[PDB]
Amino acid sequence: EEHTIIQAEFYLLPDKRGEFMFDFDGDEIFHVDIEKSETIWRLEEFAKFASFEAQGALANIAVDKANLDVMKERSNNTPDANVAPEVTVLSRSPVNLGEPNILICFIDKFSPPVVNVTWLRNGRPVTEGVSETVFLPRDDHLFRKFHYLTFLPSTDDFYDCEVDHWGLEEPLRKHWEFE
Amino acid sequence: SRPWFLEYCKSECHFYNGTQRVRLLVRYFYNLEENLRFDSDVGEFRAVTELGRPDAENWNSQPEFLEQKRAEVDTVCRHNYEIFDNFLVPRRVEPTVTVYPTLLVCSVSDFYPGNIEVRWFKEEKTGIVSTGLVRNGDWTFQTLVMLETYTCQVEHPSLTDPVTV
């Protein structure tokens, strides 16, 4: 039994956004939505087996914010280059016409942890049947993130995952068709 | 380009044999570069870069803090393992296997954990290309093992007896 639990937290400027999430063998156990101040389990069945006081997460964050100002002054505010993500698209299962499926947009190896992702069906943004995951931690100092799209496979529809980040020259767009 | 400032901290609990040998690793990263570590095997703070030195100085001179820190292997790491060991460690999701030609393809999808073996068949060690293990990000994995041209066999911790074609 060789495993690895990871308490990942951070604070980012100037976006003024923080995060607190737990990680088991590379998969999210849960995180805390700071705004609503509550625990959000990656899978619903988890809630039965555990609990986490969200207050502690917000507490940590506040300290993170603090420390961040300390780290900025210590490095003369010395900025750093941004790291562009690598986007990939693929279905969750084999794709069968008329058989509901899920498109997975995978943003990886990027930092800072802040991006804008847009699902596109036939060139139009989709706001229905769209999910996403918080910024997940990698072995290294870079981040990871997933976006999901519920869809019915047809030969007429074509999809695009559009990812915008400060490391790119222009929004990135990975394509996907049933072809 | 645009300037950014990130305070990033990863508190890592490592288990080599369940609660047998546990190791705590606290990692602190400023921007894209790590600057400070606390390895339970060292028991002390160690700066990874120039930037992490001031902290190491300060914290290492806090006897009760280091003391509380060393204990956290148990008070935190162990404590959590006994909790997760109930649902996360023993999680088994049976894979779904499908064979089809685009070049024959063996689709092994929707399975956990990621430990899995997919073999083409006598067995063929030639003309085999796979996408590699793919994490779905929802506690499920998938992989495509393709044979250049029949039987596809799959072994997995969730399967007492192997699955075939």
Partner: peptide, 13 residues
């Protein structure tokens, strides 16, 4: 539904 433990963020400076 046991409670999960976590490391309190240390103070810098």
């Amino acid at each position: 539904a046991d409670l999960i433990a976590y490391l309190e963020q240390a103070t810098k400076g």
